[PDB]
Amino acid sequence: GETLGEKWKARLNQMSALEFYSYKKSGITEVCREEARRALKDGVATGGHAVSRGSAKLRWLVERGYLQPYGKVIDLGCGRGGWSYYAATIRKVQEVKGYTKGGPGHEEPMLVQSYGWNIVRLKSGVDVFHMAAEPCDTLLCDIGESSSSPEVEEARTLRVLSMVGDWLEKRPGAFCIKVLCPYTSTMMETLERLQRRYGGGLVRVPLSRNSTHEMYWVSGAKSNTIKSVSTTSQLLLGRMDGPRRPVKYEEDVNLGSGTRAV
Ligand SMILES: Nc1ncnc2c1ncn2[C@@H]1O[C@H](CN(CC[C@H](N)C(=O)O)Cc2ccc(F)cc2)[C@@H](O)[C@H]1O
Ligand SMILES: [Cl-]
Ligand SMILES: [Cl-]
Ligand SMILES: [Cl-]
Ligand code: NA
């Protein structure tokens, strides 16, 4: 039986360019990035700006208690560093190590001086699938590239989750892991097994675009896998009908400036 998410994906692939353009942000939550983009383009490192939209996504989770970062944070797939720099502002966090592949077509770490920047070490040139897991207190991972093929998205998600398992075996107390494809029958079974083994639960972040079914597996959630995924599928399906709905806005995160004592 085709799941609601698989029905959503088939409809998404049937949309014309114009339908997709109007659908992808219909009714979502967004931060306005115009000020940060201008400041970062002008080389301003001290204005508090987030380096990417990722800081707002992690903020949404942390402010609601979906995880409580602390201690040594490892950020797999850090990109420019939006999760790493947000984590560095958190009182209980004491060290942030981000790893990202970089190279052609992939974002490099951005060096800025938001609050806590001196406890952040971002390393490019690192493929985390070839990296030995190391102990940490908080494990973050934001890897997963969209594909028009749900079979490709499932294969990519299984690859991420297999890799993350090696890190979870070190028993971090807090975690946030992107799940690109939660919506196939096989994926829901896999995620249920992983929740039984490592805990946590799935949450949909409302800053995600309607064009992806990504959910985050986070240590502070506790929810039925099938219900949480199906509720998201129905939400995304419902937004395909009717008029385009307005975007809702937070102000972009401001991460301040200055160093931290450690
Ligand atoms: N195997 C990999 N090893 C290391 N880094 C990788 C690997 N595969 C992908 N990446 C990089 O992961 C980043 C994913 N970003 C992270 C955003 C970050 N949390 C922030 O807040 O700035 C999200 C993402 C972007 C594009 C996309 F298509 C899928 C995910 C990227 O920089 C990858 O190069
Ligand atoms: Cl990715
Ligand atoms: Cl991927
Ligand atoms: Cl929950
Ligand atoms: Na690059």
Author numbering: 5 to 266
Authors' own words:
We determine the thermodynamics parameters of binding of MS2042 to ZIKV NS5-MTase and elucidate a high-resolution (1.55 Å) structure of MS2042 bound to ZIKV NS5-MTase (NS5-MTaseMS2042). We postulated that a 4-fluorophenyl group attached to the Cε atom of the methionine portion of SAM would have the capacity to bind a portion of the RNA binding tunnel that spans the SAM and 7-MeGpp binding sites. The asymmetric unit contains two molecules of NS5-MTase (molecules A and B) related by two fold non-crystallographic symmetry. Overall, the core of ZIKV NS5-MTaseMS2042 adopts a Rossmann fold (residues 54–223) with seven β-strands (β1-β7) and four α-helices (αX, αA, αD, αE). Amino acids belonging to the catalytic tetrad (Lys61-Asp146-Lys182-Glu218; a feature of 2′O methyltransferases) adopt the same conformation as in ZIKV NS5-MTaseSAM and NS5-MTaseSAM,7-MeGpp structures. Overall, the NS5-MTaseMS2042 structure is very similar to the NS5-MTaseSAM and NS5-MTaseSAM,7-MeGpp structures with r.m.s deviations of 0.17 Å (247 Cα atoms) and 0.18 Å (254 Cα atoms) respectively, indicative of little or no change in the protein conformation in accommodating the extra 4-fluorophenyl group of MS2042. The SAM portion of MS2042 overlays almost exactly with the SAM in the NS5-MTaseSAM and NS5-MTaseSAM,7-MeGpp structures, wherein the adenine ring is sandwiched between the side chains of Lys105 (partially disordered for chain B) and Ile147, and the N1 and N6 atoms establish hydrogen bonds with the backbone amide of Val132 and the side chain of Asp131. The 4-fluorophenyl group of MS2042 extends into a shallow cavity, adjacent to the SAM binding pocket. There are no specific hydrogen bonds with any amino acids and the fluorine atom projects into the solvent. Most of the contacts between the 4-fluorophenyl group and the NS5-MTase are van der Waals in nature, wherein one edge of the phenyl ring (C2-C3) runs parallel to amino acids (146-Asp-Ile-Gly-Glu-149) in the NS5-MTase loop connecting β4 and αD of the Rossmann core.
